[PDB]
Amino acid sequence: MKPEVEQELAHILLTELLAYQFASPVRWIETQDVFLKDFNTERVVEIGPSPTLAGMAQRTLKNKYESYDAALSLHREILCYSKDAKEIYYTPDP
Amino acid sequence: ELKPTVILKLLKENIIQMEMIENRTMDGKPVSLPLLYNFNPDNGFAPISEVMEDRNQRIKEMYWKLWIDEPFNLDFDPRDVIKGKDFEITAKEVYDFTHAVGNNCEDFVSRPDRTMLAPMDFAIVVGWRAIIKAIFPNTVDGDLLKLVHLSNGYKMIPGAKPLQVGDVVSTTAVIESVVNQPTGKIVDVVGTLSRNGKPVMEVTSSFFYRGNYTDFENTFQKTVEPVYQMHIKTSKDIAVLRSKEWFQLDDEDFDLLNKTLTFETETEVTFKNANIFSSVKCFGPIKVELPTKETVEIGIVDYEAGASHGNPVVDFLKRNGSTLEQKVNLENPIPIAVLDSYTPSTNEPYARVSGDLNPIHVSRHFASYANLPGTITHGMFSSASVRALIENWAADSVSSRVRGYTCQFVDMVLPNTALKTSIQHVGMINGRKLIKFETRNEDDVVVLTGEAEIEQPVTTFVFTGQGSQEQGMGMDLYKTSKAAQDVWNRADNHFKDTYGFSILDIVINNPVNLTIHFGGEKGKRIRENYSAMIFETIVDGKLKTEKIFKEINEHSTSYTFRSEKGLLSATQFTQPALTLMEKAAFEDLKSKGLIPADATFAGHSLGEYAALASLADVMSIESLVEVVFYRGMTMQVAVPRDELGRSNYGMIAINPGRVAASFSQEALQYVVERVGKRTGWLVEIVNYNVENQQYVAAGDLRALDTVTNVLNFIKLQKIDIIELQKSLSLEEVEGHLFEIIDEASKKSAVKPRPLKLERGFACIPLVGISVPFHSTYLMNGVKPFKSFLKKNIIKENVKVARLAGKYIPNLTAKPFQVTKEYFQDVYDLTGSEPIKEIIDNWEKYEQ
Numbered sequence: 001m002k003p004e005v006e007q008e009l010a011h012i013l014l015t016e017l018l019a020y021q022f023a024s025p026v027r028w029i030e031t032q033d034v035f036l037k038d039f040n041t042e043r044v045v046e047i048g049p050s051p052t053l054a055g056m057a058q059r060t061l062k063n064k065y066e067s068y069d070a071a072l073s074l075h076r077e078i079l080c081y082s083k084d085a086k087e088i089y090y091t092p093d094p
Numbered sequence: 095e096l097k098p099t100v101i102l103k104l105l106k107e108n109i110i111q112m113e114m115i116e117n118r119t120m121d122g123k124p125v126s127l128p129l130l131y132n133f134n135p136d137n138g139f140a141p142i143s144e145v146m147e148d149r150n151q152r153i154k155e156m157y158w159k160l161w162i163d164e165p166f167n168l169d170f171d172p173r174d175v176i177k178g179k180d181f182e183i184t185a186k187e188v189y190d191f192t193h194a195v196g197n198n199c200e201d202f203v204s205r206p207d208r209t210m211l212a213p214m215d216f217a218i219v220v221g222w223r224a225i226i227k228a229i230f231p232n233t234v235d236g237d238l239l240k241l242v243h244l245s246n247g248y249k250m251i252p253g254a255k256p257l258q259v260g261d262v263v264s265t266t267a268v269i270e271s272v273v274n275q276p277t278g279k280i281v282d283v284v285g286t287l288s289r290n291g292k293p294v295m296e297v298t299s300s301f302f303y304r305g306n307y308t309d310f311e312n313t314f315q316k317t318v319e320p321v322y323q324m325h326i327k328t329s330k331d332i333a334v335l336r337s338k339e340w341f342q343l344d345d346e347d348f349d350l351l352n353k354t355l356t357f358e359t360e361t362e363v364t365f366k367n368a369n370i371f372s373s374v375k376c377f378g379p380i381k382v383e384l385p386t387k388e389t390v391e392i393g394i395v396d397y398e399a400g401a402s403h404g405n406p407v408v409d410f411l412k413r414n415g416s417t418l419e420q421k422v423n424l425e426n427p428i429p430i431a432v433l434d435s436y437t438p439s440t441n442e443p444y445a446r447v448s449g450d451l452n453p454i455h456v457s458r459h460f461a462s463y464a465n466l467p468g469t470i471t472h473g474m475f476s477s478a479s480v481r482a483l484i485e486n487w488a489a490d491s492v493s494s495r496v497r498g499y500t501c502q503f504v505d506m507v508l509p510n511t512a513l514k515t516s517i518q519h520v521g522m523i524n525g526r527k528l529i530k531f532e533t534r535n536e537d538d539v540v541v542l543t544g545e546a547e548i549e550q551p552v553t554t555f556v557f558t559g560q561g562s563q564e565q566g567m568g569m570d571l572y573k574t575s576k577a578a579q580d581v582w583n584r585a586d587n588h589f590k591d592t593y594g595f596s597i598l599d600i601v602i603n604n605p606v607n608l609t610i611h612f613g614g615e616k617g618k619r620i621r622e623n624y625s626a627m628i629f630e631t632i633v634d635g636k637l638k639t640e641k642i643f644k645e646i647n648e649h650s651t652s653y654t655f656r657s658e659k660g661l662l663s664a665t666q667f668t669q670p671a672l673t674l675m676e677k678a679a680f681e682d683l684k685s686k687g688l689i690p691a692d693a694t695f696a697g698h699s700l701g702e703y704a705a706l707a708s709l710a711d712v713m714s715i716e717s718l719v720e721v722v723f724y725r726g727m728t729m730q731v732a733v734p735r736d737e738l739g740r741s742n743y744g745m746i747a748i749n750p751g752r753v754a755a756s757f758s759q760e761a762l763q764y765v766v767e768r769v770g771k772r773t774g775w776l777v778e779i780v781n782y783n784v785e786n787q788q789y790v791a792a793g794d795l796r797a798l799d800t801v802t803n804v805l806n807f808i809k810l811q812k813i814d815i816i817e818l819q820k821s822l823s824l825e826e827v828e829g830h831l832f833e834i835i836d837e838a839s840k841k842s843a844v845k846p847r848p849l850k851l852e853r854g855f856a857c858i859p860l861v862g863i864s865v866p867f868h869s870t871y872l873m874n875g876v877k878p879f880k881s882f883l884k885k886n887i888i889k890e891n892v893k894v895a896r897l898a899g900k901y902i903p904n905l906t907a908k909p910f911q912v913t914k915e916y917f918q919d920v921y922d923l924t925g926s927e928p929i930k931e932i933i934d935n936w937e938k939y940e941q
């Protein structure tokens with residue numbers, strides 16, 4: 001597949017994804033599963049004014065990934081831009 | 095055992111030969127270095143003179159037999175590429191190497207059900223015979239006993255995985271530079287390892303021949319200059335740039351005005367003497383920043399002089415432009431550790447695995463002859479030793495996270511020395527922590543300084559949707575951050591010029607009403623823009639253009655936007671406001687170096703747009719705020735408002751775990767489906783947020799109040815639906831639920847049309863939400879919104895590399911991949927003609 005045809009197919013798929021997203025349910029259970037389990041994410045950074053999606057991650061970890069986090073001995077940081085900016089920018093207090 | 099190391103005898107009548115012997119060699123056969131001295135008994139004070147004719151060749155002959163596996167031949171051009179034999183990485187070579195340098199990382203040990211990696215210090219093991227072959231040529235003439243290794247560096251190539259056991263690695267080395275300095279000659283070599291045809295990493299060694307060199311005809315210097323940016327404001331700056339013979343655009347009529355130019359220039363220089371260049375070249379692309387911040391080639395620098403004293407191109411850009419710096423320091427350094435290491439008692443074990451059999455590290459006599467304090471530790475040993483600490487303490491023992499490592503060798507270390515490495519996290523560079531270190535000996539003398547580039551931990555960015563917004567959001571960052579300023583201003587200018595309001599005004603002041611005036615020549619243009627806004631629907635194969643703002647004609651002087659509590663809570667302003675603060679936050683991160691090159695990302699609802707704009711630069715700021723404005727306007731027309739601007743629609747967050755532990759999410763889907771059919775109103779589940787803890791039902795504000803009352807009843811009565819529908823009856827529970835729904839529907843219908851929604855036990859109403867987002871109500875809006883997206887997402891700005899396996903759409907919660915299997919999945923959710931046509935014709939697209 002040529003880059004210029006991948007580009008055209010990507011553009012079509014991306015336009016159709018956004019278009020239909022408008023008026024189709026938000027599968028955020030499945031999306032969490034992906035970035036939390038499939039990619040073993042260790043820093044979830046929420047960009048936004050309230051820590052609502054950081055709320056949802058912490059609750060989805062505590063619910064169905066307590067035994068899987070302990071086994072694989074991994075430390076997740078769930079950081080919101082609007083609360084935990086000192087941890088995101090690496091500017092800790094002396 | 096006891097072996098002959100120095101043999102001193104007369105060769106002829108007047109020539110003393112002191113044969114120095116190395117007994118630690120590639121094949122075991124001892125190697126002789128004949129030093130020759132004239133004996134002149136006429137000069138009693140100093141009867142011994144050194145034979146200095148071909149003395150550097152004799153020394154190169156010895157070191158060639160120790161280092162290089164090839165036939166001895168010093169006639170090759172330093173300008174030519176040096177090619178090294180292919181090196182298969184074996185488990186035994188990695189074991190032997192890791193135990194020598196004291197690297198106890200689990201990644202380099204054989205484990206069951208796991209593949210052994212090779213350390214990136216092992217790059218010098220593969221590269222040594224190529225890299226060192228670059229200081230041997232006749233035209234790089236130097237005493238190799240007086241050879242200092244100044245610095246060594248590794249750089250992993252972006253995308254390239256680290257070296258594994260069983261990989262076959264091809265080296266090539268080239269001399270970057272060789273310059274005569276007053277105090278001796280520097281030689282910058284640049285190895286490149288290559289596995290399966292692709293390049294993996296770059297080794298950059300610099301060596302220094304101490305002495306006095308006047309052979310400037312053989313010196314040269316390639317330099318990569320730092321990227322330079324110029325903001326073209328005036329027709330003066332254009333005229334200065336068109337003056338310069340070396341500034342060469344591809345199309346001479348290109349409009350440079352208001353554009354940002356980058357100059358990525360390499361300088362090549364030969365020398366005539368210490369300070370006058372006999373030849374300069376400064377070549378390289380000139381790129382222009384597009385509105386997406388993506389740079390594109392529009393010309394070249396092509397300076398070419400003879401005898402000069404300077405590069406005028408660089409001096410021009412130093413004054414007129416500004417140095418783009420990839421490394422951003424943190425506010426304060428963050429100490430990591432202060433660690434002790436020991437140099438080993440003997441240098442043989444490192445010499446055996448590295449192939450660096452330099453006698454000065456093993457033989458007392460050679461080290462004595464070279465004026466060194468003793469058999470000095472290998473510089474490369476100390477490098478690999480400290481790199482093993484950095485990797486344990488900055489990288490938390492994950493070898494794959496070290497992507498760069500450079501160390502300057504400051505001073506010579508003796509065996510059995512105690513070294514103290516301080517390790518600081520000092521900056522960022524393209525989402526890689528930038529770790530400085532300094533290693534001091536017992537006398538607190540700096541012996542080894544360097545820096546490493548450690549990847550951050552696997553990161554995903556998530557972007558919040560609507561509901562979060564609040565007066566004053568992003569404004570702290572707007573006052574301080576230059577990158578946030580550039581986002582907000584670019585958008586605020588585009589709204590002011592086009593729709594005649596400031597998005598910044600609305601976020602700072604959250605006015606209840608906003609009137610747009612169409613007076614003057616400026617207000618006629620703005621009113622045309624509010625009429626040019628159309629729905630391009632496709633009905634019976636014919637474009638029907640409908641008007642948003644049907645109450646704005648040719649004869650209108652104002653238009654008023656109306657809300658009940660504030661216009662920041664009105665979707666068409668929420669969406670741009672909230673997309674911009676997210677995009678500005680993210681641009682502040684990107685300016686401070688904090689964004690991994692392979693970060694995944696996902697947006698909740700609206701966030702998707704900010705996410706794609708932030709991480710993938712698919713739209714400009716101006717295109718983005720246009721798209722989400724239209725999107726918010728496409729949603730405000732589908733919902734009937736009253737005079738104050740409040741609708742009969744909203745959203746409830748439902749916790750099925752608060753009603754009853756037994757009451758699952760399929761119980762909540764069952765109830766809502768029933769309450770949507772009995773009452774005959776609109777209610778669906780739209781946001782699946784947190785499993786059995788937070789679902790979001792959008793729809794008709796009455797239907798929501800009946801669902802809230804039904805679930806408030808089911809908690810208090812303590813009556814499960816799942817046990818009763820299976821173990822008691824079949825479809826009796828349906829008819830038993832319909833009278834519970836009717837009880838709630840009779841109490842909710844009597845209330846007035848814009849009824850306030852109350853906090854139930856298992857249901858909380860969302861604040862500032864008046865639209866049924868992600869429902870089937872908004873299905874009629876898709877057809878026009880899609881046609882609008884095609885006009886504003888330009889296919890040339892969809893870089894597939896930046897989305898592929900990184901972006902997770904809300905629609906299909908699976909990483910974005912351009913594959914038939916993914917298009918099929920997208921069609922099985924949203925039956926669209928263009929997706930189907932792509933699936934069926936997949937093969938023609940494949941070639």
Ligand SMILES: CC(C)(COP(=O)(O)OP(=O)(O)OC[C@H]1O[C@@H](n2cnc3c(N)ncnc32)[C@H](O)[C@@H]1OP(=O)(O)O)[C@@H](O)C(=O)NCCC(=O)NCCS
Pocket residue numbers: 052055559560561698699747748749752781787788790854855856857858860867868
């Ligand atoms: C619903 C939301 C406000 C809850 O976040 P929060 O304010 O942190 O709430 P908490 O989970 O900390 O709970 C606070 C209290 O609110 C109430 N509450 C929260 N969720 C509730 C629910 N589903 N049902 C009933 N009451 C609930 C409880 O009284 C709870 O008290 P507790 O501390 O004893 O649990 C938030 O997650 C949200 O706004 N989600 C929707 C996001 C969304 O869909 N956006 C895009 C729109 S298309």
